[PDB]
Design a protein around this ligand. Structure first.
Ligand SMILES: [Zn+2]
Ligand SMILES: [Zn+2]
Lengths: 347, 347
């Protein structure tokens, strides 16, 4: 009675019909217009479960697989719960898909029982309807399209990384790894006023997107020493380096490419250890900083989009319908290194 | 004439007689009373040269090996140069032994041509007399003995690490490795208001000195998991951890022993790589911070000494004469783990 994409087991995401969820007193029913593919969705497709509860129920959702998937979405309010006064039918909204013990207060991205809508349960954007509590809503300005709204959440991970960093207007930066996440970091750096952004990337398609976003390409295959090159063109190093590859050798380079008191922000996911040179941190009084999730960031993202940043013209590379999610969505992400963000339409 | 201790080659420090230096217009001649052993001095004895210029002259000293050794010293002004107005004969002084391109301005400890008095040249405290420029002098308050003055420089290394950290009054800290440097950090932590300081140390003599300075002993041989113990006695981890062992496994533990947004300050020396878990930094939004030398710190140290911190009663464990420097000094640092700081008297 509602078409949805549910995760049942690894490599087993089904496009099935499930019952429309009832709008409970605290909630608001959204008819989804667009939803993106996180790459976390890609990671649970190929090698889950990681964030999807399967063995024990998730503490806050209290639900196990199968779960509907999809954060990074926007849509139109079609029905309003019992206690809701800040949203009427017809309102255009986006969702900050974080479940936390005490709500969106304090450091909710680091809450012990934290979970994601579309991963831990509570609905998902790869469906026609999702019923979320109004504490997770943001009004979509009329200037911004629904597709722009579907880009709010993934832009937030990038912007929260840049805002969390020592970066100031006019400073120089480096992004190591310019996949979909690294590219969003480049756009966020330009919003924050970064000038020279040194993008270290091998793939020509990804090099040609980073250059469109305003970065300088440092091809590891065309330079003898990447760290020496960034040091030469900056006179001692960039002010902030962003590690997005998850490669141990590259984490070393990111630290070595910062100047006196520079900062290395780790954005990538790590499963195994990595050998660093702690001397490189001590010699120049450097700093390494961890970043996960985001918090108190959606208004800033929404405001920057009204100014042209995080444009869907630059970041959205494909629009698909929910039926074609397996082959035209995940499949395209697996085969085409040129894909940045893919938006999914329920019908 | 003048008796001095010179570094000629590795494991080759000689007690010789050299020329009393001229008091040049900008300089001040100090009759040294006491000088300490940094462990940097010990490291040049066992495996130098490291900071000792040998091949090429040092940029600022313009001086090659051999060199007189010894920073962390105090003494009595016995002759004053042509341009000096802030120091008269008889003044009791201590020396901040940093040579930098632009003097003691900006971040002179990270200056490209940076060098240490007693290592890069320009005299040293293991001699009867030293001729330094007055920008490197600080008046020794009458409350503090000459022995107290000789502790300013090593105290500055410890205090500068603590002040450079996110530590606030009441917070909890952990010190991994309680050798001579770690012990000075514990005393510095108490000055800054650290309450529960978890000292991770195997040596009973060093455990019982750290306990005297106000820390809690975490014996690795008496607990199955060091970080698990520190994590629960703090309810999730300390706020700042100090790594002083230089062992890769311990750097992992220091990072893992910090709480949400915790900070790991590296104080140890590193020559080879070290395997960390970058995931440990990302999950809890942690920070790892490098610290080398010190800057703009001597007045703070001197003031805290007037209040009883960094007391020589607690930190000076042996006083020797310069003649016995090799066997009762360096040898004692290698063989007796109960030694904290050893002071050396010229005659
Ligand atoms: Zn996401
Ligand atoms: Zn020293």
């Amino acid at each position: 009675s509602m078409k949805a994409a549910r995760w049942h087991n690894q490599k087993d995401i089904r496009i099935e019909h499930i019952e429309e969820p009832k709008t409970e007193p605290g909630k608001v029913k959204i008819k989804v217009k667009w939803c993106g593919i996180c790459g976390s969705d890609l990671h649970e497709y190929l090698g889950g479960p990681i964030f999807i509860p399967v063995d024990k129920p998730h503490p806050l959702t209290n639900e196990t697989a199968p779960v509907t998937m999809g954060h990074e979405f926007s849509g139109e309010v079609v029905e309003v719960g019992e206690g809701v006064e800040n949203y009427k039918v017809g309102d255009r909204v986006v969702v900050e898909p974080i479940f936390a013990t005490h709500g969106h207060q304090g450091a909710y991205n680091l809450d012990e029982q934290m979970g994601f809508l579309g991963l831990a349960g509570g609905g998902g954007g790869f469906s026609e309807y999702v019923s979320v509590d109004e504490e997770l809503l943001f009004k979509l300005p009329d200037e911004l399209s629904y597709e722009q709204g579907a880009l709010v959440e993934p832009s937030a991970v990038a912007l929260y990384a840049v805002r969390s960093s020592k970066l100031k207007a006019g400073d120089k930066a480096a992004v190591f790894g310019c996949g979909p996440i690294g590219l969003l970091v480049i756009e966020a750096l330009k919003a924050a006023g970064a000038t020279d952004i040194y993008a270290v990337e091998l793939s020509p398609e990804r090099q040609q997107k980073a250059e469109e976003l305003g970065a300088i390409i440092v091809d590891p295959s065309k330079t003898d020493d990447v760290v020496a090159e960034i040091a030469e063109r900056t006179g001692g190093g960039v002010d902030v380096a962003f590690e997005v590859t998850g490669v141990p050798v590259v984490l070393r380079q990111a630290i070595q490419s910062t100047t006196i008191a520079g900062e290395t922000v780790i954005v990538s996911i790590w499963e195994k250890g990595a050998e660093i040179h702690p001397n490189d941190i001590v010699i120049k009084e450097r700093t390494v900083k961890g970043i996960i999730g985001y918090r108190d960031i959606f208004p800033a993202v929404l405001s920057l989009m009204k100014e042209g940043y995080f444009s869907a013209d630059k970041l959205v590379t494909k629009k698909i319908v929910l039926d074609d999610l397996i082959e035209e969505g995940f499949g395209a992400l697996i085969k085409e290194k040129s894909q940045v963000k893919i938006l999914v339409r329920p019908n």
